Amino acid sequence: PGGVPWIAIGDETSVTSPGALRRMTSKDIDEPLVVVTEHAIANFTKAEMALEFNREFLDKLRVLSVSPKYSDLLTYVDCYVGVSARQALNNFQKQVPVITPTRQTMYVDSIQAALKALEKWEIDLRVAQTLLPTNVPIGEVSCPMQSVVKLLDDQLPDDSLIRRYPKEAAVALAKRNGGIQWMDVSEGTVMNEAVNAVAASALAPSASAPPLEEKSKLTEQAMDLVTAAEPEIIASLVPVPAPVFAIPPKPADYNVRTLKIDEATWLRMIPKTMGTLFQIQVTDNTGTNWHFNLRGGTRVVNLDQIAPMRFVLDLGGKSYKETSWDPNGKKVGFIVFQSKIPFELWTAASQIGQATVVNYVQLYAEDSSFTAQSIIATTSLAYNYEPEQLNKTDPEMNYYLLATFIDSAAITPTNMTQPDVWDALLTMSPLSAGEVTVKGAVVSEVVPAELIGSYTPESLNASLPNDAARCMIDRASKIAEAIKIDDDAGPDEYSPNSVPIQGQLAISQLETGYGVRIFNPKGILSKIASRAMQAFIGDPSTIITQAAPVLSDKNNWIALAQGVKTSLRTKSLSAGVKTAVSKLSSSESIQNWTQGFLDKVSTHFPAP
Amino acid sequence: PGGVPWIAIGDETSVTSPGALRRMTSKDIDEPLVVVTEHAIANFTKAEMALEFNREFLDKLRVLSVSPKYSDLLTYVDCYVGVSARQALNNFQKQVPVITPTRQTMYVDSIQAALKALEKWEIDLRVAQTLLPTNVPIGEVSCPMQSVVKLLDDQLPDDSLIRRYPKEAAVALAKRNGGIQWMDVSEGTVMNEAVNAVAASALAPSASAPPLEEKSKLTEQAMDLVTAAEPEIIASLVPVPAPVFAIPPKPADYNVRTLKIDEATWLRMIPKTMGTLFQIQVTDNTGTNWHFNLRGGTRVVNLDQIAPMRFVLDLGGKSYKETSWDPNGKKVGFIVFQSKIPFELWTAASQIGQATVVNYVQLYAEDSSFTAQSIIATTSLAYNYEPEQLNKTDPEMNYYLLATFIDSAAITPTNMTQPDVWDALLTMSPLSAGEVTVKGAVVSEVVPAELIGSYTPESLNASLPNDAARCMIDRASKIAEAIKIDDDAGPDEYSPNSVPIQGQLAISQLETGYGVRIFNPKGILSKIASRAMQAFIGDPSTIITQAAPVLSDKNNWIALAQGVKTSLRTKSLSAGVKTAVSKLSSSESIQNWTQGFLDKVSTHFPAP
């Protein structure tokens, strides 16, 4: 039963309009009055049963021997009943169980106090169960009870009260587990007295089959995984908003000096062989001006369009030692320029436009265990790039990122010849969570089907940490895991989730398309479909990888994704025979090992 | 129902005292009477229903065609049944459901055998389901039965038992497929009257809305995340028990030559300029004597105070070539010295004290990739060291670990100038996670608020994996996941998640500003809060950053954490319609694509 008590606002037994009704009050019988659910009553009853499970310790504690009996508190009455006034006006009810919250609280507090008091006995009882094996993998085994007692007495806790109170522990163990047997000395009677025994036999797995509940649970978990993956999103053929498609990104490290300009569209560089060299000066946050020289081959990250990004650089163990340059004790910084002039075209400092020195550190160099090898001390040079902090308005304004040793005074060009210090190990942390990259560009939305099989290994490797392909691969790996949970078919073994792929391949060959037509036998297509599904599960990143042999078709991909979900939808308590038989064989062998151990115990713990 | 019928030995449940109560017996009517939960009765009924899905195949097996009616086996009789004797005395009931354990076992075994018998026929039927697209975006859709039959014949597998039993298969398809309806031979009527459609609706979206069970499961996963987080503990600013916060440590690799002792409190190395080289010889437990000399500038692991640790060393690629000594084929060893004098304070041979080589490796080297350069082969010198073996009883006693070449024969120091072979790839596995440093100080117990915002990026890098900050970050990642489930709003958009954040900033705005004091608009406050929240979504681990301007307030994080847990607890079935509707639209277009493909197939295999 559910709802709250409603009493006539004004005239008793003549109520017609909602205006005529009001919430019935405690003063009408002013504490709360609530309808008691049968389900709650049954659960409290189960709670009392757990208390009876722990009854021996509480009695030995000489405290609260009387059981709570929650059913006593219930009060059933005929009246208008509803969660809202409307229901009660249309819902008069009879004998509704009712109680005040405060009384329920007192009852629960008493139960909680009881559990806290019984805390030690249950732990000691579990210790008694774990002292020796208390359960058998299959069937049952038995041994000399006096020999069993000898072993228990030998390993029993020294301070255990059970050493003074064995019988209560014996009753408790007999209550939870059917196998342990304590004969009644008075009648010499022995029989299972447990009331959980029937339930245990009901919930035991069959002689050759695992429990039905396990199959249902696994299938439900697989469906939850598929729902979390979002098959419609992964297999989407229409544009998907970047926030909807994207998932949390992960950091990536790069060496800018070693990057290939034919791979990265996010970097700009001054042409080499130009012989260009010019020193430039930039103020720091304290207003100190710092001067450094720019030369051909100097490269910069093109900040515009890359989103807010945090960069941390570690040069530890590097050399960078020059004929007139020693990195030891040097100072380095990250340089960011803001100007309308392209960096590659820069020949003078003014084309750098707005620049500020905001960060620098003093370097340390040392010599390695290998002779003639010098090691730079570990560094953590960090630059935070906020495009919003720049607040770019003028499109002409171009943003460039540089990392180089920084000095307040223009450097003698002969002393330091490097175009930049980008030959360093860089750790990048995105400062943007709203930008994703597709086809070399940040995207507000993407086509997942187009995403399928659209990246070469080189392109994916060059991709930034915010790349859509990486997010797609993570979603694909979740789907592959879900498909593998749903299908236990081996490679080259057909399944309800692979045959649709075989059908798609057959339809594709039949379809009038382009190129040399061929007919493939159904069995071969079926084997290929099984292999394709296994390959997808093994390497979900293949889905955005170019040249997928069979998974390349977005329609094939959709069919497979939909098929696994449907298999879960129409599946009822499915199971695998091979695993169950292996478990039974293992259980029997373990039982044999246990029986041998018990025989050894009987020899080493002979009954007195 | 449940519990154990209770009476005195002469009459069960008739004992004034608890011990004599006895089980109801067949003489009362040697299996004990077994009470059954109403839920248990319903589940057994569902199991019998499960048999009916392919019960036609059982009829093919001619086994248990009759519906089971285990409820008939259930027998209701008035009696006193008590889980505890006290309980049975307290309450008396009538028409108690009863069963014999053996009968229950036989019934369950029979049901399991039936499922096992129907497994192959059911698998063929599931393959038949997988043969065609079987999911529809709204309700159910159907296809030409004749065209469907043509396709079944086109792709039908010969081995299918359906070839053995087609009519039953047709009945089963009608039983479980809304789209598949067979015209009645007698009535020429095609329709679905099966309860599978009722079953589909049970897990299907509601008449007025999409299914909310998935949203409920997602909310439950979020509550599980909150339970794992224990945020008040993870937001503590006051002393916390170390074990509850502590979590398992992770092994990490470092190069001692690359190691920077000054930045890290933990790192210990003999200072350079001591320049002390002395040859020492000791024998091991086996009794092998080894001659080796400690040299100036040598650094050693400070074993004292670091607890148990296992270390693996790779020296491959270090030239290490002596004038008359070839590094290839040489043996190097790890030496542990135990003595009162500080290793840095060591100036004489006697100072090393209990110095022992725990492990040593002899290895061969070959030419490297570098032109004219040879490379030592890949190596893993490894030793596991724990505190008990040292058994330190004296604080003066200090323990140190060193990597250097070790040989039984005396080795001339002039030829080999290396202070140590510590300039090598090293893998260290922690055997203890009890050491943390905060406030620039090593701490026995850790305060999460002290952990919050206490490490600079270089300082965090200095912090070892055992540092509490990493554990705080993992707890934050679970919290971050909960926050993400809670809010899917776009960046810079005010949201329920940021309400605690805006309130915290507002209190900060209320706070009198020490030195510079300014007032910021609540809408501007909302924009900044949105940026801050998006930044957290980008990187939760940033919270540990010392004095993090973005993550400056620990109390704000603590308050938000309580608020986020509340929002998850407060959440009552709230979900977003737009993504689902877009997915349904794509699904409908896919359904249209599927219809077109089936149409082309009918062109190939037209329905008569």
PDB file of C-alpha atoms in Angstrom, chain B residues 28-257:
ATOM      1  CA  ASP B  28       2.992 -33.877  12.574  1.00  0.00           C
ATOM      2  CA  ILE B  29       1.687 -33.824   8.941  1.00  0.00           C
ATOM      3  CA  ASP B  30      12.555 -37.057   7.315  1.00  0.00           C
ATOM      4  CA  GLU B  31      12.616 -33.794   5.261  1.00  0.00           C
ATOM      5  CA  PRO B  32      11.784 -30.717   7.424  1.00  0.00           C
ATOM      6  CA  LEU B  33       8.762 -28.559   6.493  1.00  0.00           C
ATOM      7  CA  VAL B  34      10.134 -25.720   4.293  1.00  0.00           C
ATOM      8  CA  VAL B  35       8.360 -22.311   4.212  1.00  0.00           C
ATOM      9  CA  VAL B  36       8.540 -20.375   0.895  1.00  0.00           C
ATOM     10  CA  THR B  37       8.733 -16.603   0.200  1.00  0.00           C
ATOM     11  CA  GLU B  38       5.874 -15.225  -1.949  1.00  0.00           C
ATOM     12  CA  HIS B  39       8.685 -13.737  -4.091  1.00  0.00           C
ATOM     13  CA  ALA B  40      10.264 -17.222  -4.169  1.00  0.00           C
ATOM     14  CA  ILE B  41       6.924 -18.685  -5.366  1.00  0.00           C
ATOM     15  CA  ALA B  42       6.741 -16.034  -8.108  1.00  0.00           C
ATOM     16  CA  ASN B  43      10.337 -16.789  -9.242  1.00  0.00           C
ATOM     17  CA  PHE B  44       9.635 -20.552  -9.449  1.00  0.00           C
ATOM     18  CA  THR B  45       6.544 -19.683 -11.536  1.00  0.00           C
ATOM     19  CA  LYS B  46       8.720 -17.501 -13.811  1.00  0.00           C
ATOM     20  CA  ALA B  47      11.097 -20.475 -14.182  1.00  0.00           C
ATOM     21  CA  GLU B  48       8.214 -22.727 -15.306  1.00  0.00           C
ATOM     22  CA  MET B  49       7.210 -19.918 -17.714  1.00  0.00           C
ATOM     23  CA  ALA B  50      10.814 -19.930 -18.995  1.00  0.00           C
ATOM     24  CA  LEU B  51      10.277 -23.585 -19.986  1.00  0.00           C
ATOM     25  CA  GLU B  52       7.279 -22.619 -22.219  1.00  0.00           C
ATOM     26  CA  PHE B  53       9.366 -20.465 -24.636  1.00  0.00           C
ATOM     27  CA  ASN B  54      10.869 -23.564 -26.327  1.00  0.00           C
ATOM     28  CA  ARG B  55       8.640 -26.064 -24.460  1.00  0.00           C
ATOM     29  CA  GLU B  56       7.541 -27.166 -27.962  1.00  0.00           C
ATOM     30  CA  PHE B  57      11.096 -28.567 -28.395  1.00  0.00           C
ATOM     31  CA  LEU B  58      10.685 -30.364 -25.024  1.00  0.00           C
ATOM     32  CA  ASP B  59       7.500 -31.797 -26.591  1.00  0.00           C
ATOM     33  CA  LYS B  60       9.764 -32.826 -29.505  1.00  0.00           C
ATOM     34  CA  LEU B  61      11.851 -34.444 -26.726  1.00  0.00           C
ATOM     35  CA  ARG B  62       8.433 -35.506 -25.281  1.00  0.00           C
ATOM     36  CA  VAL B  63       9.638 -34.478 -21.784  1.00  0.00           C
ATOM     37  CA  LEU B  64       7.521 -32.650 -19.127  1.00  0.00           C
ATOM     38  CA  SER B  65       5.047 -31.315 -21.742  1.00  0.00           C
ATOM     39  CA  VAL B  66       2.669 -30.767 -18.771  1.00  0.00           C
ATOM     40  CA  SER B  67       3.120 -27.371 -17.063  1.00  0.00           C
ATOM     41  CA  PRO B  68       5.015 -28.038 -13.728  1.00  0.00           C
ATOM     42  CA  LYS B  69       2.655 -26.358 -11.150  1.00  0.00           C
ATOM     43  CA  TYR B  70       5.313 -26.410  -8.347  1.00  0.00           C
ATOM     44  CA  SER B  71       2.833 -24.157  -6.468  1.00  0.00           C
ATOM     45  CA  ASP B  72       0.783 -27.367  -6.056  1.00  0.00           C
ATOM     46  CA  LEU B  73       3.903 -28.873  -4.412  1.00  0.00           C
ATOM     47  CA  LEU B  74       3.782 -25.803  -2.137  1.00  0.00           C
ATOM     48  CA  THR B  75       1.543 -26.782   0.802  1.00  0.00           C
ATOM     49  CA  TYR B  76       0.027 -24.211   3.208  1.00  0.00           C
ATOM     50  CA  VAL B  77      -0.639 -25.320   6.823  1.00  0.00           C
ATOM     51  CA  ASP B  78      -1.282 -23.300  10.023  1.00  0.00           C
ATOM     52  CA  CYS B  79       1.758 -23.659  12.331  1.00  0.00           C
ATOM     53  CA  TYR B  80       4.409 -21.958  14.509  1.00  0.00           C
ATOM     54  CA  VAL B  81       7.522 -21.482  12.309  1.00  0.00           C
ATOM     55  CA  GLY B  82      10.479 -19.531  13.741  1.00  0.00           C
ATOM     56  CA  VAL B  83      13.952 -18.664  12.398  1.00  0.00           C
ATOM     57  CA  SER B  84      14.685 -18.353  16.150  1.00  0.00           C
ATOM     58  CA  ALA B  85      12.832 -20.140  18.983  1.00  0.00           C
ATOM     59  CA  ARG B  86      11.954 -16.754  20.495  1.00  0.00           C
ATOM     60  CA  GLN B  87      10.500 -15.660  17.145  1.00  0.00           C
ATOM     61  CA  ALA B  88       8.292 -18.780  16.851  1.00  0.00           C
ATOM     62  CA  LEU B  89       6.939 -18.185  20.381  1.00  0.00           C
ATOM     63  CA  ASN B  90       6.273 -14.497  19.537  1.00  0.00           C
ATOM     64  CA  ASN B  91       4.169 -15.038  16.370  1.00  0.00           C
ATOM     65  CA  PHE B  92       1.827 -17.839  15.159  1.00  0.00           C
ATOM     66  CA  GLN B  93       0.673 -18.154  11.516  1.00  0.00           C
ATOM     67  CA  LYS B  94      -1.641 -20.361   9.388  1.00  0.00           C
ATOM     68  CA  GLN B  95      -1.480 -21.922   5.878  1.00  0.00           C
ATOM     69  CA  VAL B  96       2.333 -21.761   5.996  1.00  0.00           C
ATOM     70  CA  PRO B  97       3.763 -22.876   2.593  1.00  0.00           C
ATOM     71  CA  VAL B  98       5.821 -26.099   2.950  1.00  0.00           C
ATOM     72  CA  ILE B  99       8.083 -28.349   0.837  1.00  0.00           C
ATOM     73  CA  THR B 100      10.604 -31.211   1.241  1.00  0.00           C
ATOM     74  CA  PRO B 101      14.200 -30.247   0.305  1.00  0.00           C
ATOM     75  CA  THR B 102      14.628 -33.363  -1.908  1.00  0.00           C
ATOM     76  CA  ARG B 103      11.443 -32.475  -3.881  1.00  0.00           C
ATOM     77  CA  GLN B 104      12.674 -28.902  -4.357  1.00  0.00           C
ATOM     78  CA  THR B 105      16.030 -30.292  -5.556  1.00  0.00           C
ATOM     79  CA  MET B 106      14.393 -32.698  -8.033  1.00  0.00           C
ATOM     80  CA  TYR B 107      12.143 -29.902  -9.369  1.00  0.00           C
ATOM     81  CA  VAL B 108      15.067 -27.497  -9.892  1.00  0.00           C
ATOM     82  CA  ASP B 109      17.211 -30.231 -11.478  1.00  0.00           C
ATOM     83  CA  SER B 110      14.358 -31.096 -13.868  1.00  0.00           C
ATOM     84  CA  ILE B 111      14.035 -27.438 -14.965  1.00  0.00           C
ATOM     85  CA  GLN B 112      17.819 -27.191 -15.527  1.00  0.00           C
ATOM     86  CA  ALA B 113      17.843 -30.450 -17.530  1.00  0.00           C
ATOM     87  CA  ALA B 114      15.022 -29.051 -19.693  1.00  0.00           C
ATOM     88  CA  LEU B 115      16.980 -25.860 -20.512  1.00  0.00           C
ATOM     89  CA  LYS B 116      20.069 -27.991 -21.293  1.00  0.00           C
ATOM     90  CA  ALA B 117      17.964 -30.195 -23.628  1.00  0.00           C
ATOM     91  CA  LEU B 118      16.528 -27.165 -25.492  1.00  0.00           C
ATOM     92  CA  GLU B 119      19.895 -25.352 -25.867  1.00  0.00           C
ATOM     93  CA  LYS B 120      20.779 -26.392 -29.493  1.00  0.00           C
ATOM     94  CA  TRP B 121      17.260 -25.937 -30.948  1.00  0.00           C
ATOM     95  CA  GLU B 122      17.067 -22.527 -29.201  1.00  0.00           C
ATOM     96  CA  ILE B 123      20.499 -21.565 -30.658  1.00  0.00           C
ATOM     97  CA  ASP B 124      19.261 -22.432 -34.181  1.00  0.00           C
ATOM     98  CA  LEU B 125      16.165 -20.261 -33.470  1.00  0.00           C
ATOM     99  CA  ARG B 126      18.406 -17.360 -32.258  1.00  0.00           C
ATOM    100  CA  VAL B 127      20.426 -17.698 -35.488  1.00  0.00           C
ATOM    101  CA  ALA B 128      17.095 -17.444 -37.339  1.00  0.00           C
ATOM    102  CA  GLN B 129      16.431 -14.229 -35.399  1.00  0.00           C
ATOM    103  CA  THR B 130      19.936 -12.976 -36.350  1.00  0.00           C
ATOM    104  CA  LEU B 131      19.230 -13.826 -40.009  1.00  0.00           C
ATOM    105  CA  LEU B 132      17.295 -10.562 -40.567  1.00  0.00           C
ATOM    106  CA  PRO B 133      17.365  -7.055 -39.009  1.00  0.00           C
ATOM    107  CA  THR B 134      15.236  -7.513 -35.836  1.00  0.00           C
ATOM    108  CA  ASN B 135      15.227  -4.040 -34.179  1.00  0.00           C
ATOM    109  CA  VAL B 136      12.840  -1.128 -34.930  1.00  0.00           C
ATOM    110  CA  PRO B 137      13.194   2.567 -33.806  1.00  0.00           C
ATOM    111  CA  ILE B 138       9.497   2.974 -32.846  1.00  0.00           C
ATOM    112  CA  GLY B 139       7.370  -0.032 -31.771  1.00  0.00           C
ATOM    113  CA  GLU B 140       7.780  -2.888 -34.287  1.00  0.00           C
ATOM    114  CA  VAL B 141       7.941  -3.084 -38.136  1.00  0.00           C
ATOM    115  CA  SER B 142       7.172  -6.097 -40.365  1.00  0.00           C
ATOM    116  CA  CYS B 143       8.293  -7.371 -43.800  1.00  0.00           C
ATOM    117  CA  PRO B 144       6.618  -9.422 -46.602  1.00  0.00           C
ATOM    118  CA  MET B 145       6.303 -12.949 -45.196  1.00  0.00           C
ATOM    119  CA  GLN B 146       6.826 -14.505 -48.664  1.00  0.00           C
ATOM    120  CA  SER B 147       9.911 -12.327 -49.326  1.00  0.00           C
ATOM    121  CA  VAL B 148      11.044 -13.207 -45.794  1.00  0.00           C
ATOM    122  CA  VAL B 149      10.622 -16.959 -46.580  1.00  0.00           C
ATOM    123  CA  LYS B 150      12.534 -16.496 -49.849  1.00  0.00           C
ATOM    124  CA  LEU B 151      15.417 -14.937 -47.848  1.00  0.00           C
ATOM    125  CA  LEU B 152      15.255 -17.715 -45.215  1.00  0.00           C
ATOM    126  CA  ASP B 153      15.588 -20.319 -47.993  1.00  0.00           C
ATOM    127  CA  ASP B 154      18.402 -18.259 -49.590  1.00  0.00           C
ATOM    128  CA  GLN B 155      20.486 -18.141 -46.380  1.00  0.00           C
ATOM    129  CA  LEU B 156      19.029 -21.156 -44.517  1.00  0.00           C
ATOM    130  CA  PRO B 157      21.774 -23.399 -43.014  1.00  0.00           C
ATOM    131  CA  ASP B 158      21.145 -27.088 -43.924  1.00  0.00           C
ATOM    132  CA  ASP B 159      22.211 -28.441 -40.468  1.00  0.00           C
ATOM    133  CA  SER B 160      19.452 -26.433 -38.717  1.00  0.00           C
ATOM    134  CA  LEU B 161      17.033 -28.645 -36.734  1.00  0.00           C
ATOM    135  CA  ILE B 162      14.392 -26.297 -38.205  1.00  0.00           C
ATOM    136  CA  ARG B 163      14.942 -28.351 -41.376  1.00  0.00           C
ATOM    137  CA  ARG B 164      14.164 -31.262 -38.999  1.00  0.00           C
ATOM    138  CA  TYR B 165      11.252 -29.348 -37.336  1.00  0.00           C
ATOM    139  CA  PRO B 166       9.895 -26.466 -39.512  1.00  0.00           C
ATOM    140  CA  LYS B 167       6.275 -26.203 -38.224  1.00  0.00           C
ATOM    141  CA  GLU B 168       7.336 -25.781 -34.564  1.00  0.00           C
ATOM    142  CA  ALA B 169       9.929 -23.229 -35.740  1.00  0.00           C
ATOM    143  CA  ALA B 170       7.176 -21.249 -37.512  1.00  0.00           C
ATOM    144  CA  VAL B 171       5.066 -21.329 -34.314  1.00  0.00           C
ATOM    145  CA  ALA B 172       8.097 -20.152 -32.270  1.00  0.00           C
ATOM    146  CA  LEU B 173       8.822 -17.275 -34.709  1.00  0.00           C
ATOM    147  CA  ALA B 174       5.184 -16.131 -34.365  1.00  0.00           C
ATOM    148  CA  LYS B 175       5.618 -16.560 -30.564  1.00  0.00           C
ATOM    149  CA  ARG B 176       8.663 -14.257 -30.362  1.00  0.00           C
ATOM    150  CA  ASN B 177       8.506 -12.043 -33.498  1.00  0.00           C
ATOM    151  CA  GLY B 178       6.049  -9.151 -33.997  1.00  0.00           C
ATOM    152  CA  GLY B 179       7.307  -8.484 -37.542  1.00  0.00           C
ATOM    153  CA  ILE B 180       7.038 -12.176 -38.432  1.00  0.00           C
ATOM    154  CA  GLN B 181       3.347 -13.155 -38.555  1.00  0.00           C
ATOM    155  CA  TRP B 182       2.091 -16.278 -40.390  1.00  0.00           C
ATOM    156  CA  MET B 183      -1.269 -16.178 -42.223  1.00  0.00           C
ATOM    157  CA  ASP B 184      -3.574 -18.755 -40.569  1.00  0.00           C
ATOM    158  CA  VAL B 185      -4.018 -21.680 -43.000  1.00  0.00           C
ATOM    159  CA  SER B 186      -7.639 -22.089 -41.805  1.00  0.00           C
ATOM    160  CA  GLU B 187      -8.412 -18.366 -41.185  1.00  0.00           C
ATOM    161  CA  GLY B 188      -5.961 -16.621 -43.548  1.00  0.00           C
ATOM    162  CA  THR B 189      -5.145 -14.373 -40.560  1.00  0.00           C
ATOM    163  CA  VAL B 190      -1.658 -12.846 -39.976  1.00  0.00           C
ATOM    164  CA  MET B 191      -1.077 -11.179 -36.560  1.00  0.00           C
ATOM    165  CA  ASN B 192       0.955 -11.308 -33.312  1.00  0.00           C
ATOM    166  CA  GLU B 193      -0.981 -12.331 -30.158  1.00  0.00           C
ATOM    167  CA  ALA B 194       2.203 -13.475 -28.349  1.00  0.00           C
ATOM    168  CA  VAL B 195       3.084 -12.138 -24.853  1.00  0.00           C
ATOM    169  CA  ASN B 196       6.664 -11.597 -26.167  1.00  0.00           C
ATOM    170  CA  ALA B 197       5.350  -8.191 -27.293  1.00  0.00           C
ATOM    171  CA  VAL B 198       4.212  -7.624 -23.656  1.00  0.00           C
ATOM    172  CA  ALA B 199       7.698  -8.787 -22.614  1.00  0.00           C
ATOM    173  CA  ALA B 200       9.253  -6.359 -25.140  1.00  0.00           C
ATOM    174  CA  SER B 201       7.113  -3.484 -23.764  1.00  0.00           C
ATOM    175  CA  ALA B 202       8.225  -4.337 -20.206  1.00  0.00           C
ATOM    176  CA  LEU B 203      11.843  -3.448 -21.180  1.00  0.00           C
ATOM    177  CA  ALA B 204      10.631  -1.121 -23.979  1.00  0.00           C
ATOM    178  CA  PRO B 205      10.102   2.673 -23.705  1.00  0.00           C
ATOM    179  CA  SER B 206       6.814   3.710 -21.971  1.00  0.00           C
ATOM    180  CA  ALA B 207       3.560   4.660 -23.742  1.00  0.00           C
ATOM    181  CA  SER B 208       4.240   8.334 -22.878  1.00  0.00           C
ATOM    182  CA  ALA B 209       8.098   8.166 -22.850  1.00  0.00           C
ATOM    183  CA  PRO B 210      11.409   6.290 -23.533  1.00  0.00           C
ATOM    184  CA  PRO B 211      12.494   3.634 -20.952  1.00  0.00           C
ATOM    185  CA  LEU B 212      13.757   5.111 -17.621  1.00  0.00           C
ATOM    186  CA  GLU B 213      15.394   1.866 -16.363  1.00  0.00           C
ATOM    187  CA  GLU B 214      18.661   2.841 -18.139  1.00  0.00           C
ATOM    188  CA  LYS B 215      18.686   6.306 -16.505  1.00  0.00           C
ATOM    189  CA  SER B 216      18.052   4.574 -13.138  1.00  0.00           C
ATOM    190  CA  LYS B 217      21.006   2.198 -13.713  1.00  0.00           C
ATOM    191  CA  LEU B 218      23.260   5.153 -14.644  1.00  0.00           C
ATOM    192  CA  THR B 219      22.182   7.002 -11.469  1.00  0.00           C
ATOM    193  CA  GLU B 220      22.909   3.814  -9.445  1.00  0.00           C
ATOM    194  CA  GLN B 221      26.437   3.638 -10.949  1.00  0.00           C
ATOM    195  CA  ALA B 222      26.893   7.296  -9.901  1.00  0.00           C
ATOM    196  CA  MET B 223      25.765   6.429  -6.315  1.00  0.00           C
ATOM    197  CA  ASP B 224      28.271   3.523  -6.288  1.00  0.00           C
ATOM    198  CA  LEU B 225      30.957   6.069  -7.328  1.00  0.00           C
ATOM    199  CA  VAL B 226      29.938   8.366  -4.416  1.00  0.00           C
ATOM    200  CA  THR B 227      30.110   5.369  -2.021  1.00  0.00           C
ATOM    201  CA  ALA B 228      33.653   4.596  -3.259  1.00  0.00           C
ATOM    202  CA  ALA B 229      34.639   8.285  -2.929  1.00  0.00           C
ATOM    203  CA  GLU B 230      33.670   8.808   0.760  1.00  0.00           C
ATOM    204  CA  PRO B 231      34.197  12.559  -0.018  1.00  0.00           C
ATOM    205  CA  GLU B 232      34.093  13.961   3.566  1.00  0.00           C
ATOM    206  CA  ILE B 233      37.069  11.662   4.248  1.00  0.00           C
ATOM    207  CA  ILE B 234      38.706  12.738   0.947  1.00  0.00           C
ATOM    208  CA  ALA B 235      37.950  16.404   1.731  1.00  0.00           C
ATOM    209  CA  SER B 236      39.236  16.208   5.352  1.00  0.00           C
ATOM    210  CA  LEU B 237      41.331  19.171   6.616  1.00  0.00           C
ATOM    211  CA  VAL B 238      41.818  17.543  10.056  1.00  0.00           C
ATOM    212  CA  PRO B 239      43.869  14.440  11.021  1.00  0.00           C
ATOM    213  CA  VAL B 240      42.771  11.219   9.222  1.00  0.00           C
ATOM    214  CA  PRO B 241      43.824   7.596   9.954  1.00  0.00           C
ATOM    215  CA  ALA B 242      46.647   6.847   7.467  1.00  0.00           C
ATOM    216  CA  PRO B 243      45.457   3.312   6.475  1.00  0.00           C
ATOM    217  CA  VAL B 244      41.926   4.414   5.386  1.00  0.00           C
ATOM    218  CA  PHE B 245      43.400   7.036   2.985  1.00  0.00           C
ATOM    219  CA  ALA B 246      46.365   4.833   1.910  1.00  0.00           C
ATOM    220  CA  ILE B 247      46.092   2.697  -1.293  1.00  0.00           C
ATOM    221  CA  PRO B 248      48.542   0.292  -3.068  1.00  0.00           C
ATOM    222  CA  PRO B 249      51.838   1.836  -4.383  1.00  0.00           C
ATOM    223  CA  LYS B 250      52.996   1.687  -8.051  1.00  0.00           C
ATOM    224  CA  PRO B 251      56.586   0.756  -9.153  1.00  0.00           C
ATOM    225  CA  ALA B 252      58.469   3.550 -11.002  1.00  0.00           C
ATOM    226  CA  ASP B 253      61.741   3.845 -12.995  1.00  0.00           C
ATOM    227  CA  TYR B 254      64.507   6.443 -12.451  1.00  0.00           C
ATOM    228  CA  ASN B 255      68.201   6.916 -13.361  1.00  0.00           C
ATOM    229  CA  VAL B 256      70.345   7.835 -10.307  1.00  0.00           C
ATOM    230  CA  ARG B 257      72.631   9.887 -12.574  1.00  0.00           C
TER     231      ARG B 257
END
